[model samples]
Target: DDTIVVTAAEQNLQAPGVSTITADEIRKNPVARDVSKIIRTMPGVNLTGNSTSGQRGNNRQIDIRGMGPENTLILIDGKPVSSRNSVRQGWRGERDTRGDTSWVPPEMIERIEVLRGPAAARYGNGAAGGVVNIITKKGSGEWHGSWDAYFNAPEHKEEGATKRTNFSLTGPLGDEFSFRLYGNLDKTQADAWDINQGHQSARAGTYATTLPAGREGVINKDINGVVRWDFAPLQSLELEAGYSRQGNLYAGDTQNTNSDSYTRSKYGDETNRLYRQNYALTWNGGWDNGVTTSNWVQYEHTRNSRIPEGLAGQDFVDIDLDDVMLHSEVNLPIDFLVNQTLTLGTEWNQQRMKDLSSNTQADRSPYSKAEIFSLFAENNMELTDSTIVTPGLRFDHHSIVGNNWSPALNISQGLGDDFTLKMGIARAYKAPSLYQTNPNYILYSKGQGCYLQGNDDLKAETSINKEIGLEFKRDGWLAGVTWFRNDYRNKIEAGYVAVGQNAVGTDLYQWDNVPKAVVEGLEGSLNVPVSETVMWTNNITYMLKSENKTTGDRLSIIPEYTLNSTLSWQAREDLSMQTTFTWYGKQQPKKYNYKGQPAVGPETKEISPYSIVGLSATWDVTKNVSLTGGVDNLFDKRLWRAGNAQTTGDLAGANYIAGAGAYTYNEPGRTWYMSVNTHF
Candidate 1:
């Protein structure tokens, strides 16, 4: 097993712009669900929503140190994973905003290397917000495999339910070849929140009658295998290929609003699937003069499918998408002088997307093809024995969106052997996602019939990100802080439209291109030892976003502040206990009844703040086996964290929704689950 914790910065500092999480760290604080939630523990890390299992591949957005997810690429085993660009031409349809970042299995993760700040100069356009490179374990020595099975019942949902089963196998394949196979099965039944109880306190005084909220749940399963063949005739040459397919069915909220009776049961299910395939070839060689060069070529493909839920009384939605990508990268070590080594690398990638649906609104494509070509170069210059500087540049060309040039710089200063300071700055752009450029409307499924139109003329927004941070580690104390600001232009948004019962029909929403806005925030964290066996980790993120220039009012739906804290105790080498807490600040919802405006603004009141706490523990029966369980939302707090239901009749707030999107409905009050695993 590979157990070394690698870092370019001093010690194990969780510095803003430079860092990686070790395998031990991940297993130590095992995530209940969702890889995205696990990654947010790092500084400058931001997630689209607040659930572990709900937001899988659909709506999970990553903003590292102010860099957007599109600009912050995710790489697996040093190869570019398949990505969906919603902005591709003739292929306009809004993405499923359910925000699922749960595709990546935590059991498959060997280490999560999070590189923050401006990496575009090196990694290309998407590197602006940084990069999350998932490195899986390399098979070595003898045959190896492990199995993990567990059942957990949190207080918020049903109790004593098994949630996950996972396994992995790796070993030598006929001498010079190696292979690894892995699989995971995860399921979470409908929680108390997933039900449509049919009554709203906000509408309590109205004719709203209590009914079933809705029944929803998620069942996800994935299986993948990787193979590497080494040619003994050419020691420097190797070829590898892999395929992964993870699919899940997400049941959206049942729209029960009726015409005569306010509580008509209008329910349906929305199902979606995501699949990926990857292949790569590589060559490596070393010169006698301490110079080495490595080259790699790769290909990846992703397909997403969504069944219509509109006519079913759910949101009007349909998806049939496929994206293909080709990539190549080369790295050369100029020289090796112990602490002063210079390294350079260049990467080129091209991607295309095809949509197979006319059911989507116009600007949405039935068949679309788009390509992105990029050239990037970065050089790591070890300025001194204690200081290092990396500067890079990249040029990207997209068939439909034109071209963009990104530049970035990163600097790290070492203070002694345990303290490091880092700073990063870059100019990067987020190409319109295929969905942002093309959107599908679910016409008013909530109450009436409203149509959503796509905006094909929308331009990709660009941002300038600046980040600075420091990491300090001394004995049992580790702390870090990061400050980030993003200056953005050409943001995409849906124009507001009022709903009128004109006996004619429901309301309609139109896509609109908005002006510039700015989002800035500060994130700080501390990991301190309260005793020899107890450690406390606290993280607080303060966000201040403004888009008055674009919307004529404060942009709605984003919280100004979010605080998360974790406390863990290693009661013994084999036993651990943990607690997690989150606090959200007051949020201002969309304006349906804007004051002082000739136009309508928010008709509903603002959302109040709320707090949640959870408890968990792990028991290691042996080196290869363990038992785990946890309780979520122990207090069963009822809260609203997203859009105002009164204001946005057609839409729901993500925070209020059980999943990541507003349409997912509310979260359960309490749930409990437990599980067990063993290695062989």
Candidate 2:
């Protein structure tokens, strides 16, 4: 029998402001649980949080170009993926932050693309900072199977261990159909920390807190699966369907609290269970005269249930999302220009949420379904032999806020044969999330001498972005430099409400819109061949200014400079090793008020500068078997993460609660792991 074959054309890197990562790089990386960590090697990307497996595992935020997570858009195989924006109730309610990179298994990803500019006109909403597209591996005609497993141990004896295993298969059943299947299993023991050097300066007696003194590491268990099928009923028509499910279990201390001589006993353990499912279908057809058409539909569902050590009844949350898209385009040769292409598309999206809390005091839900219908069009014009221009526009009709219009322009010109210049201007907007727009009391907290409330009057946050970049490549050397600025208007800000001294003292966190703000930065990257067996790569970013336009105060949690570099060496035909170094500049101190008062008591301290080093190596034991080992945080340096510290609540000083916010959560240090993969 003649076997069917599949091959993808190699991508050309002539474009500017685009970065691509291959599967080989991912398989060799020491930290590979989440795409956020895999993409951190690129410029203008920032990551924070633990890489563990359960509740805290991969619970990280990825910010692009110094923008918030909400401004980033994530896609899987050209279709939009779901992002969690609803408020989660119970102990984690205040920390209900989610990103799209959480549920996907790293082993199944074939490649990743990072688009570093506003493309709202083409991708719809949430494209302000950039776009991250994850492409998965597909099936070929020949039967193939692979298995990989890894185990990690910390240098500190008290720390828990981590283990993961993955299996994948792909093959053709008959002449008309092909299929692929993948599954992953992972478990992580609770993180271990030194009690002597933990968060608190002093133990305040031997009361001995039940929970971890610093980061309350949880035991995590996770399982994920993916299945895909492709069929061709006719030569011109193709159809594809895919299904994915991920289930997770977290068991450990629910709350991290200070149980000192002064603080009382309000501590508890927690068990959190999570489940996610995704279904997708697509149809593609080739028409006469170079016309092509495609249609896609997807459904995503997520459920979260938590049982705390002390709380009665379970806290449950459910979310359902649906997306549909239709696209058509045509290519034609024009006499006036070098070439021409026109495209049109329309999309529909809807989200529904339901949350039930056993403690009625923390419950707020049966949220109204959020919906949006959008239509967009674009034209690619080849103005000259070495120049191209693309202009696009999109209109979206929201179920609640009405209509929004976005437009963008991009121009590219080649200088000689080794250099390319590109510029882009775009306008983008992020509609208020269901929790933000729902006309109800989303949060009711009575602490810190403050009462907080949500508002339905919040408007869409809008941004106008502009950028210019130059890229060049020759021989084995590549380099890029880009400068970008973003002007954000009607930014959502929390207003502090002053109340009577005894009237249930609380801060009113009413959401209000601010006039404007600006974030401008410069980014650079380089890849060079140092010798026949050695290579070097570097990425750097510099923030010139990030400030509130009206008050002219610098923003918090953003670093002024970041640098990352890697050196790779091929020791022999079967062995390769790499070392990576990263540095983050110190963060300026941030200040907050007590009951809306100026000159706050002891400003929030600056996060000290820190650097990290890592080493990894891979050895091909055989043609189909390989062994990989690596060490992360080689120096075991412990430094405060700006993203975590800005939100940490528990402090000895008067401003807020103790052991609270992101600062209390420290980054992991000195981790080692080894893995072996075999395929036939």
Candidate 3:
């Protein structure tokens, strides 16, 4: 019974449909420059919008299995991090923190683990899609350090460019002390495009204007460090502390064409600045009775400010948020009916936010507070030698949206030494944001010209997720396939409401719940060794269904098919080369216009399918040094995002004039990069 319990406990730790990327893969990636872009190569993941668009900073919106970025949870070193989704006031656009994954430097990460289904049973809210856990590098007894630098640019010097540098050090101090430190600096430049001609007129037609050329640029900096104290404090207790600080500044220069480009005003500009700091403390230990426990105390703060040049005090906005969290978990291994394990945990989070604007009417409040408390438990049972069953439950109480409960079940069975099967079912919920629940109205004059009113009666969004997967491993190759489906109810979305007849631009927008949406997909991955010196790997996803019951329309921006593959060859002992390919299928387009308009009509132009190919090579210069070079978009293909293309004609009542809008397909062509890495 004791032996069975130990095996069951170990098996329960491996979740179904999980994917992992190691540091070695990060160093060899050909087309990606950061963590966010690198993860886009994985199966069931989609990335939209350009990182240089000044829309979301260096980070892009990532959707996992079509669940959206807001539903996916991000964690650093197994600890939760806060994000921003508040509705802002003024013309600067929504201040979103969804790109927090890009804050961690690539060199500082040891591995990234992705759980591909609902994970509310393990994590708390925002886990309806999945969970992404980033494991940071830790110090060892031996002194070690590394430095990495890379630069990439388009073929045309005036088009675009990217550059990055990262440095890290890890070593042991005296007897019981150790430390790790990492820092990074990244910069990007998007070239200015002249739209004063008819090429712009071809797309915008009568709405086109003679807009001057403009450019977008961004700069990012990050510094993080960790320190640990071993057995000096107690016999079986270990303590660790960590701190991180990150900052980003994005600026753009464009012609202020409120009127026709022929009579445009002076040069207009915009700038957005974001800063964040996190401090965390961790404690772990083992006690008698085969019991182990872990505890954490953390504090985080973030500030985002947006200023539009020439708008003066009327369009300036500043937001500040602070978070404090305490969490604890306990695990006990015992021999029950067969071998079994029991786990229990509790978490408490408190957050305070302050929004300030030059105009008092645009301000939300001097201060607002939100709190979350959760309690959870899980149990694993070994029914047979090759079978394991796990059940878990969680209860969460939010100060704003009341309380909720979540439940999950998982089953794993081994068919033989080479085959395994797993299945899971879970239910999750997402609570309303601070900007959504407050009764105060935060006015905004951007994004189709709208005013946002808070809805205190809003209900939490709920989802039911199910998945089953089968894996086979033989010799040196592996293959796996999974089928997943998610049904959502009470989905929250922004809806327009007509307040009065003589409104300036668009109608008032408020948060409301929709009927339902069902998203289903199939994902498969294969790895095989073709020869002694050659390897092949590929992954593909087919979205079988994604539809809204009420509108009978497919989910916007989600492609029906996505694929990635790589073929690698080891030509010599010190040299290797790889060729990679990526594909995105065509998507149905949607229509968009100001609500007050009589008829905006549906978009007739659909996004076309696009593919890209890349090549990379690595050479080991010496025992401790290496050089890598790559060329992405070898064919220089042109691709446009479905979301961006739909909004091209919706600029009538927004911040920019009709003909002054930027291009939709901003992805750069044939780009080259070289990297050098050294260890000391």
Candidate 4:
């Protein structure tokens, strides 16, 4: 066996709880719409949005283990952006919550790192769930460039369709300088669906209504560039500086209508915008004792706008946010055993935001400020010849909300040439968003919670997680499995009272906090090279989830089973083909009518099971050129992902709501697309 003296953490001893995914893996069987869509496959991870637009569009929620969205910390190049406006806020609904995955561009990313447990002990308040670190590509050489385009057609169902174009350029200006540029434009249209058609169970004397089709139209454009100067005054001293900006726009579903008791669709046209600029400076090396340290100081500014309802009267709502952070990291090796590594870091964060609503009386009034500071430290130790452990801690102090602390522990043991065992435990926390802790009068659907107001006393949620797993990597096969459980307290939730009146009953909703809950699950994967030319990868997950507080009653939106797999064939040195399958088990809907009463029978009926398949291909025409294309949802299954009413399709209600507006919408039909790329 080769005793590889790898970097600190050595995978098992890594002070950082990070798992790396290659760019190529992202491109293959890619969920090109957003990076969050692809990372869902990781263990102990759950996503709140799947739609290309609507509730699941620019807004996304990530919960690690059972920590909820706030606990997970997201980073770009090791730096955290202000997500205060993107996470979920009870009274604000999904509208004002912060945590959108729409900003990062895949083409600009070189790799993604994920650590599946509480990270706040090292990252800050937003890391209660864990951490997702996005690393962008670096430029090298002289005058180098590449162009790539992606297109996808509906396979069988008609849900979402897309066409994307990308171009990137990079080169060195001189021995001490470099520059890089990237741009992307997308145009997409997805088919609508009737939610009631997929309902599997019904109430007494009740039937699902037929849903009218609801479609989403989206157009997104973005551009970013970075110029860096590496200044060296002495052989041991180095200084670097750079700046970047990224932006995009989203629009979709506005006209909501119901066809029958089981059929209902709401097409709310919306637009989401992000404008960001970052100026940063860093210092590295130059230290003695074989210890390395780096420090970065940066300032970032952002502007955001949105339209949650597709109407002239209630169509304009927006927010502008500004943030600045100073970050630093130090890596030190003690003794001659380079195996002992210590990392210490801290960040000063300041954020200010303003809310704008067309109808001040009916929307979120307005606000202009908020801020926090976080400190953290960690160490990795090689305790034995084959065993390694890492421990870390983080503390966050809010200007107004008080303080939070989190910690994590990880251990790994090598079992031979190809097997390894790993275990981890951590405490995580998520600070409440502006909309969550303080809201005026946000949107209302009448009959629901008449008018939602903010609560200043609301506190941050916290989670504790434990995980155990084994991995085997050999020449022809790769397999792994992990079992995890999380204990969550003070979960932020949404409930409602009766509000508006349509052909249906009253409307209502309000944000509230639940006492506690537990989320536990098993995730596994198998990737095997069947032959010299064929390879396959499969993943399966089973979630044994529930709110111990609610007993026997499952959480309203959690999916019990999820399965995904891919098959690929390298037909030739330059050509490749692949296919994928995705399956979701039936889910139980919520009970209680728009009036907040036991309308009848049981709580809610059970939705049915559904599956979809996809296919794609890639070709390398030359050393500097390549092409890829694919189609998804091959069999056209108009499946209902979630809903609760008299049927399975309605988008909103008093006690129930669709995670992605427009329940039971068409996923996608057969379509075709192709893309070509060249590098110079």
Best by TM-score: 3
lDDT of each: 0.55, 0.59, 0.65, 0.58
Off-target runs (Cα >4 Å) in candidate 2 are 1-15, 49-59, 86-94, 119-121, 157-160, 193-197, 201-270, 287-289, 307-338, 357-365, 447-451, 496-509, 550-556, 594-603, 640-664
For each candidate in turn, the TM-score is 0.78, 0.83, 0.86, 0.80
Tell me how far the alpha carbon of residue 100 in candidate 4 is from the true structure, in angstroms, after superposition.
3.1
lDDT by residue for model 1 (405-512), tens? 777677779888688788877776656554444545223334332555555666666667677887788888988878877776665555555433334555665555
Ranked candidates (lDDT, high to low):
3, 2, 4, 1
Q: Give the top-scoring candidate (lDDT).
A: 3
Which prediction has more favorable lDDT, 1 or 3? 3
User: Model 4, range 1-680, lDDT digits (tens) per residue?
Assistant: 22333323334323223456777766665555566756765545656432211233223466555444545677777777674453224332334433545456676678887776532334556665678888877676478888877766655334456677778888876787777777777666534443223432322222223223334445556676676666654222222233322222222322223332211222423344455555566566544454666677666666665544432212545567667787776777654453667777777877776766535332435564567777777777777888877777778787656888777788788899788888888876766666656545354433334555445566677778777788888887978887877777666655433334434444434455666778778778788999899988877767776453633233434347777777889999888898878777664443434344442433344446778787888887897887777765577665443322233233243332333222323344455667666777
Q: What shift in Å separates residue 305 of candidate 1 from its native position after superposition?
A: 3.3
Cα TM-score of candidate 3: 0.86
At residue 137, give the lDDT of candidate 2.
70
Q: Write the per-residue lDDT of candidate 3 for residues 1-680, one digit (tens) a residue.
A: 23524322234346555678888777677333457767777778776432212233223466677776666677888777674543242222223343667667776788888776743335767777777788887677569898988889788554457788888888887787777778888776644434222323223444344332333445667777777777633322334443444333222223324453422332222245667777888787665556677788888777776653442112547788788888988777767556677788899989888876434532335777889999988877878978888888888899988888888788889999788898888787777777777657445554543656667788888788888889887765878898989897776666445443223545566666767988899988899999889989888888987765655544434567888998999899889999989888765433323342222232335446778999999988896898999998899985322122223444444332232112333455788999888887
Tens-digit lDDT string for candidate 2 (214-294): 333332233333333344332222344444343323322222333332112322233344455566666664434444556
User: Which segments of candidate 3 are over 4 A away from where they belong?
Assistant: 1-16, 30-33, 49-59, 85-98, 119-121, 193-207, 210-216, 232-270, 287-290, 308-316, 358-364, 444-450, 496-509, 591-602, 640-644, 647-663
Q: Between the candidate structures 2 and 4, which one is better when assessed by TM-score?
A: 2
